[PDB]
Amino acid sequence: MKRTYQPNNRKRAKTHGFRARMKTKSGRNILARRRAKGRHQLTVSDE
Amino acid sequence: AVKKYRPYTPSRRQMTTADFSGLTKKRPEKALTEALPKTGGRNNRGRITSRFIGGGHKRLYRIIDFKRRDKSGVNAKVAAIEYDPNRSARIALLHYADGEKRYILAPEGLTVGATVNAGPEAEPKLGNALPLRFVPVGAVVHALELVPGKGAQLARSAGTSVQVQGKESDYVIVRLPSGELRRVHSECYATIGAVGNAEHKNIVLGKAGRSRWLGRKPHQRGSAMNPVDHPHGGGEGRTGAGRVPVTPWGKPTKGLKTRRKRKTSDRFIVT
RNA sequence: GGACCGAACCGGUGCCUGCUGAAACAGUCUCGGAUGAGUUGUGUUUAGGAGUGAAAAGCUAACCGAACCUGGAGAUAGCUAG
RNA sequence: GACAAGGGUUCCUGGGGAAGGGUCGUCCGCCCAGGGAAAGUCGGGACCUAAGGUGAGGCCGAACGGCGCAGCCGAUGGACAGCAGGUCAAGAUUCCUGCACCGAUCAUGUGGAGUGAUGGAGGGACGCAUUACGCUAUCCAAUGCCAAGCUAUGGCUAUGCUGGUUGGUACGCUCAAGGGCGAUCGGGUCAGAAAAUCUACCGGUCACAUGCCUCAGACGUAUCGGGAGCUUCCUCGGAAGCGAAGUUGGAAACGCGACGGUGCCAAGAAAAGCUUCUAAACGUUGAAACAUGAUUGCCCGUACCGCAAACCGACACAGGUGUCCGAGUGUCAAUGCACUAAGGCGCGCGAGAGAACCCUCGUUAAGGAACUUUGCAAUCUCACCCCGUAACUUCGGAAGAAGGGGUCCCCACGCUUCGCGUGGGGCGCAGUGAAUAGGCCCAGGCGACUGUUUACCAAAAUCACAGCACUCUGCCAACACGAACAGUGGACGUAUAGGGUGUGACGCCUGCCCGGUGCCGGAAGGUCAAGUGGAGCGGUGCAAGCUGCGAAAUGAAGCCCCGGUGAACGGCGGCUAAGGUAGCGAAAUUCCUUGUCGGGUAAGUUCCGACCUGCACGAAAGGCGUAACGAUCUGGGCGC
RNA sequence: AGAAACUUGGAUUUCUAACCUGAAAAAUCACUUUCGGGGACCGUGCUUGGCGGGUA
Ligand SMILES: CC[C@H]1OC(=O)/C=C/[C@H](C)[C@@H](O[C@@H]2O[C@H](C)C[C@H](N(C)C)[C@H]2O)[C@@H](C)C[C@@H](C)C(=O)/C=C/[C@H]2O[C@@H]2[C@]1(O)CO[C@@H]1O[C@H](C)[C@@H](O)[C@@H](OC)[C@H]1OC
Ligand SMILES: [Mg+2]
Ligand SMILES: [Mg+2]
Ligand SMILES: [Mg+2]
Ligand SMILES: [Mg+2]
Ligand SMILES: [Mg+2]
Ligand SMILES: [Mg+2]
Ligand SMILES: [Mg+2]
Ligand SMILES: [Mg+2]
Ligand SMILES: [Mg+2]
Ligand SMILES: [Mg+2]
Ligand SMILES: [Mg+2]
Ligand SMILES: [Mg+2]
Ligand SMILES: [Mg+2]
Ligand SMILES: [Mg+2]
Ligand SMILES: [Mg+2]
Ligand SMILES: [Mg+2]
Ligand SMILES: [Mg+2]
Ligand SMILES: [Mg+2]
Ligand SMILES: [Mg+2]
Ligand SMILES: [Mg+2]
Ligand SMILES: [Mg+2]
Ligand SMILES: [Mg+2]
Ligand SMILES: [Mg+2]
Ligand SMILES: [Mg+2]
Ligand SMILES: [Mg+2]
Ligand SMILES: [Mg+2]
Ligand SMILES: [Mg+2]
Ligand SMILES: [Mg+2]
Ligand SMILES: [Mg+2]
Ligand SMILES: [Mg+2]
Ligand SMILES: [Mg+2]
Ligand SMILES: [Mg+2]
Ligand SMILES: [Mg+2]
Ligand SMILES: [Mg+2]
Ligand SMILES: [Mg+2]
Ligand SMILES: [Mg+2]
Ligand SMILES: [Mg+2]
Ligand SMILES: [Mg+2]
Ligand SMILES: [Mg+2]
Ligand SMILES: [Mg+2]
Ligand SMILES: [Mg+2]
Ligand SMILES: [Mg+2]
Ligand SMILES: [Mg+2]
Ligand SMILES: [Mg+2]
Ligand SMILES: [Mg+2]
Ligand SMILES: [Mg+2]
Ligand SMILES: [Mg+2]
Ligand SMILES: [Mg+2]
Ligand SMILES: [Mg+2]
Ligand SMILES: [Mg+2]
Ligand SMILES: [Mg+2]
Ligand SMILES: [Mg+2]
Ligand SMILES: [Mg+2]
Ligand SMILES: [Mg+2]
Ligand SMILES: [Mg+2]
Ligand SMILES: [Mg+2]
Ligand SMILES: [Mg+2]
Ligand SMILES: [Mg+2]
Ligand SMILES: [Mg+2]
Ligand SMILES: [Mg+2]
Ligand SMILES: [Mg+2]
Ligand SMILES: [Mg+2]
Ligand SMILES: [Mg+2]
Ligand SMILES: [Mg+2]
Ligand SMILES: [Mg+2]
Ligand SMILES: [Mg+2]
Ligand SMILES: [Mg+2]
Ligand SMILES: [Mg+2]
Ligand SMILES: [Mg+2]
Ligand SMILES: [Mg+2]
Ligand SMILES: [Mg+2]
Ligand SMILES: [Mg+2]
Ligand SMILES: [Mg+2]
Ligand SMILES: [Mg+2]
Ligand SMILES: [Mg+2]
Ligand SMILES: [Mg+2]
Ligand SMILES: [Mg+2]
Ligand SMILES: [Mg+2]
Ligand SMILES: [Mg+2]
Ligand SMILES: [Mg+2]
Ligand SMILES: [Mg+2]
Ligand SMILES: [Mg+2]
Ligand SMILES: [Mg+2]
Ligand SMILES: [Mg+2]
Ligand SMILES: [Mg+2]
Ligand SMILES: [Mg+2]
Ligand SMILES: [Mg+2]
Ligand SMILES: [Mg+2]
Ligand SMILES: [Mg+2]
Ligand SMILES: [Mg+2]
Ligand SMILES: [Mg+2]
Ligand SMILES: [Mg+2]
Ligand SMILES: [Mg+2]
Ligand SMILES: [Mg+2]
């Protein structure tokens, strides 16, 4: 009955982290998209 | 000359394993061993390519000297003969009068402590490495170079002979273990005699686990699959219509060789 | 010793119980493996007609004969409702 | 009980009581405020490298982008100096106490000169199972020691009872298993790019036991702690002082000695630190290194939950969660079972009642499967000794076959102890006295076998499997991912190899049919694109010329045509190319069907055996057998 | 109809600077080079026709 979400600070920082989004173009597109929405840090790194 | 077992288990009844008594028991000899087996079942970009590779006992690499060209005129003593995990064809450690160790393939019948030699002035003794121009007609050799330099390539698995045939200028006919006839440059080096461990064909891996220990992994039939997965697969019951491989083609007698420059450099290839 | 019995551990055989559950797959009892083709941690690599798969069209973040999200997009609806 | 992950103040104190808490609530993991978290030595970083990631130059590519050597990043691994105690309400190898250690910089002296790299050497550098010797942790006994007191119920008056019984450090000609060991001179340049006094090879010499070197651990002396308890105060229950003893016997690790031994094959990381050598450079008055004193010690993590009410599950959820410790008695052994220590808890509604019915249990007359689709379910069996044990077999096995006996307490005698044998005696319905512990057999179908699978209705007769066969591939291999003359897998592989395909241990075997299709080979002829060729036909112009169309001949692969090809797709029949060789047959195949006969039963639509009339078996989509195996499916029997 | 020359095409053959490719002090690349082997082939760019349930 192990469930889907098994936390992990290095996992989450690695995939999803701001350095990871900034790497690929399409990630930087997620960054421009969220900034445009004015999200309170959509970037997952250190909120 | 191969081990057997009483049927004390269902799978030891057939299992057989090779003789080791002739192998010197010694570690692979550090510094001659880049190890880094780095087992890799897949392909350059993360896709599987040759199906069914899978982990077996970790190996280390022994760096064979497949050319033996720079020690010409320099005698070497046979230090020992050893298992090689990756070669199916025991290696022979070599202590040169230069005082540098080097591995070689083990010729069948190469006793420990024999002297061996390389270079054009080298008698066609067992284990010597000399050019094909200097090999007498009909002689049996292994560890031959496809090109002068670049190293040997054609006679390397255990029991593999290549017998010399004729001699055109700047070239030498030969019979490959496959039986094809090949012109080959007289400047290529080769080693005298057949490859050793000749009886390796007859070991019978007695159980599944053995093929797993070797790193081969269970090998699916198409007929067991589903149409989605493979052409033979699907259908209620069992069979198949048209016989073709994974992605489609012949597996009976579709010629696979192309129309290459190599095609001019061999006589009567078949079988 | 892909040997035996058998805890841990991995599993899931038959019955019952549970069925607005204690639980969106479980419990007691029973049962298979248990030095091996074994079990497990961390790091990491392969993905959508694509990956993986001792092969069920299985699995690919709780319903995969082709995932999710956004978008084309108010798709089209000889059909049903109003 | 201690951790990692994850959580994020949930920790401690003082308050609170709306809401969360399945009821309550004066309480709480809830609300409010204040405090608590201490490191040269533990983990990480200023060190190292693996998979993987990244990558100046470099190789590709409609863009964006994909690769890729050195290099760099990256612990899950390598390297590395501290132990014993005390104690906040709340931290502790971090603070305090006692002693110790590590690098750095400097000063005094000894020394007295050589230091010695981005480069060489060696070394760090490793598997699995099993196993001898010694030892500690640690546990057990007692009329050993120490401390306390009482005891009474019937008795004991202590040889009863309860509790305790050593950790660190330093010295030691004390004991001590186990464990590691070559030393050297010279030679060859052809060996480490060069060098080298380092390493590799060759040779001259002792390289027997030995001989060195090493202390696990023990004993002892000292010393710093600790120590059962005791003393006083007491603001409700804490605080501070003092402090005995430390025996003899036994058991024992997966820890230590260790990098021990032996056997095995599937043959068991890298790099730095580290030890040697030189190049270069400085230095050869003032060097290395040693000693003593000093100053010096950065950054991050430490609270609390952490098998769970503090993490994943929407919950204070019966689920899930990697490592480490995990005492005692009994019982062949054990992390098993029963009771229990330390420790932790009684699961955040409660009280009555003692109807139907439902769940989970205990017993049951006579009968014993008559139940039913089926013995489904639940009984029966049950551990360890002893005797005994079949067809069949691949000679291993079937086998824990089947079956029978023993099992407790006491005395004596014997023995290899704990324990056991023997003899005699005692008690109960009963002695593995409670708990953990197989029901067995005959006979078939299918698969040889262990294994694998439909996360969440299918575990199988499915997949895989060893073995077998065909076929492909000569190496920039065949095949496979791919923007692609990049790169990569195959593979640092080489025909005893690798891909594909079907078959599926083992044994006897594997028949007839190349017409159709695929494949392999042939090649006189038929056919066949673009292109080469340009006969001729037409427009326009007065003309030169410019222009539309276009025929023969010639022109590849391919197909027609010929031959072969079956563990190639395939076929082997009707009241064609061939027409079933062995084997088996009412079958997992049989329609008519409950075929007919027999066996089993009182009675047999099932099941076993025969027959053949095979609707519509048959030889690697393998045929027929086959010991062993099976939570397989089918029929019987014993026991219950 | 016999010779010379300009030749232009086709096929056999052979050669070497294009190009491919391998060892050596410098691991992918670049270099010298000894050189070595292949070699106007292959690879690739455009076009011709065949095959093409692999895919759509
Ligand atoms: C009882 C178990 C489940 O029901 C069924 O299987 C079936 C129920 C009906 C009888 C059936 O109706 C029939 O359809 C027919 C086509 C026609 C017929 N007509 C003639 C009337 C009709 O009668 C269905 C389709 C009706 C429909 C409402 C439906 O889809 C109900 C779905 C699920 O709620 C039910 C469950 O109760 C959930 O049980 C789950 O079991 C798992 C194993 C658990 O892990 C757990 O999952 C977390 C649990 O909860 C999900
Ligand atoms: Mg913010
Ligand atoms: Mg951050
Ligand atoms: Mg034998
Ligand atoms: Mg695939
Ligand atoms: Mg196979
Ligand atoms: Mg299938
Ligand atoms: Mg299907
Ligand atoms: Mg298909
Ligand atoms: Mg069928
Ligand atoms: Mg098919
Ligand atoms: Mg394929
Ligand atoms: Mg076993
Ligand atoms: Mg499973
Ligand atoms: Mg379980
Ligand atoms: Mg069993
Ligand atoms: Mg078993
Ligand atoms: Mg597809
Ligand atoms: Mg799913
Ligand atoms: Mg969810
Ligand atoms: Mg869909
Ligand atoms: Mg619409
Ligand atoms: Mg539209
Ligand atoms: Mg439509
Ligand atoms: Mg944390
Ligand atoms: Mg509290
Ligand atoms: Mg309240
Ligand atoms: Mg309030
Ligand atoms: Mg309340
Ligand atoms: Mg209330
Ligand atoms: Mg409080
Ligand atoms: Mg690094
Ligand atoms: Mg690397
Ligand atoms: Mg990259
Ligand atoms: Mg790389
Ligand atoms: Mg680490
Ligand atoms: Mg340390
Ligand atoms: Mg450290
Ligand atoms: Mg300190
Ligand atoms: Mg206190
Ligand atoms: Mg604490
Ligand atoms: Mg302490
Ligand atoms: Mg020196
Ligand atoms: Mg021992
Ligand atoms: Mg006593
Ligand atoms: Mg006592
Ligand atoms: Mg003492
Ligand atoms: Mg480095
Ligand atoms: Mg703590
Ligand atoms: Mg914290
Ligand atoms: Mg819970
Ligand atoms: Mg677990
Ligand atoms: Mg224990
Ligand atoms: Mg115990
Ligand atoms: Mg015990
Ligand atoms: Mg227990
Ligand atoms: Mg608790
Ligand atoms: Mg009675
Ligand atoms: Mg009876
Ligand atoms: Mg009846
Ligand atoms: Mg009946
Ligand atoms: Mg019946
Ligand atoms: Mg039953
Ligand atoms: Mg017999
Ligand atoms: Mg016997
Ligand atoms: Mg049997
Ligand atoms: Mg058995
Ligand atoms: Mg009696
Ligand atoms: Mg009796
Ligand atoms: Mg009992
Ligand atoms: Mg009981
Ligand atoms: Mg039957
Ligand atoms: Mg099976
Ligand atoms: Mg299922
Ligand atoms: Mg799954
Ligand atoms: Mg099931
Ligand atoms: Mg290339
Ligand atoms: Mg099959
Ligand atoms: Mg046949
Ligand atoms: Mg019958
Ligand atoms: Mg029938
Ligand atoms: Mg009868
Ligand atoms: Mg009858
Ligand atoms: Mg039936
Ligand atoms: Mg019959
Ligand atoms: Mg059949
Ligand atoms: Mg067949
Ligand atoms: Mg079969
Ligand atoms: Mg049969
Ligand atoms: Mg099984
Ligand atoms: Mg059944
Ligand atoms: Mg039965
Ligand atoms: Mg075309
Ligand atoms: Mg289609
Ligand atoms: Mg078509």
Distance CA B57, CA B21 (A): 22
Distance CA B140, CA B159 (A): 11
* Planar angle of CA B101, B104, B105, nearest 5 degrees: 160
Nucleotides, chain E, CB distance < 7 Å: 21-24, 36-39, 41-43, 53-54
Listing from the earlier edge strand, what are the strands of the sheet with B115-116?
A: B101-105, B91-96, B76-82, B115-116
Distance CA B117, CA B114 (A): 10
Amino acid letter, residue B241: A
Distance CA B147, CA B135 (A): 16
Cβ-based neighbours of A4, under 8 Å, separated by 6 or more = none
- 3-state SS class at A19: helix
Tokens of B261: 């420059």
- Answer yes or no: are the C-beta atoms of B129 and B190 closer than 8 Å: yes
* Planar angle of CA B218, B1, B105, nearest 5 degrees: 75
Cβ-based neighbours of B129, under 8 Å, separated by 6 or more = B68, B69, B116, B117, B118, B119, B122, B143, B189, B190, B191
Would you say the C-beta of B38 is within 7 Å of strand C?
no
Tokens of B210: 């053995």
Closest CA to B130 of B68, B184, B69, B190: B190
- Answer yes or no: are the C-beta atoms of B70 and B151 closer than 8 Å: no
Distance CA B91, CA B216 (A): 23
The rounded Cα B66 to chain-centroid distance in angstroms is: 12
- Answer yes or no: are the C-beta atoms of B131 and B121 closer than 8 Å: no
Cβ-based neighbours of A39, under 8 Å, separated by 6 or more = none
Amino acid letter, residue B26: K
Q: Which helix (H) or strand (E) holds B103?
A: strand B101-105
What's the CA-to-centroid distance between A3 and ligand 1, angstroms?
24
- 3-state SS class at B222: helix
Would you say the C-beta of B11 is within 7 Å of strand C?
yes
What's the CA-to-centroid distance between B237 and ligand 11, angstroms?
10
Cβ-based neighbours of B99, under 8 Å, separated by 6 or more = none
Distances (CA, A) of A27 to A14, B45, B53, B79: 13, 21, 35, 60
Nucleotide nearest to B159 (CA to C1'): D496
The rounded Cα B142 to chain-centroid distance in angstroms is: 11
C1' of nucleotide D629: residue with nearest CA: B10
C1' of nucleotide D6: residue with nearest CA: A7
Resolution rounded to one decimal, in angstroms: 3.3
Q: Which helix (H) or strand (E) holds B152?
A: strand B149-152
What residues form DSSP beta bridges with B116? B76
What's the CA-to-centroid distance between B1 and ligand 55, angstroms?
51
User: In this structure, which residues have their CB less than 5 angstroms from ion ligand 3?
Assistant: A 46
- Answer yes or no: are the C-beta atoms of B214 and B203 closer than 8 Å: no
* Planar angle of CA B119, B122, B124, nearest 5 degrees: 120
- Answer yes or no: are the C-beta atoms of B119 and B133 closer than 8 Å: no
Closest CA to B140 of B191, B92, B105, B200: B191
What residues form DSSP beta bridges with B85? none
- Answer yes or no: are the C-beta atoms of B212 and B56 closer than 8 Å: yes
C1' of nucleotide D321: residue with nearest CA: A2
What residues form DSSP beta bridges with B103? B64, B93
What residues form DSSP beta bridges with B115? B77
What's the CA-to-centroid distance between A4 and ligand 51, angstroms?
18
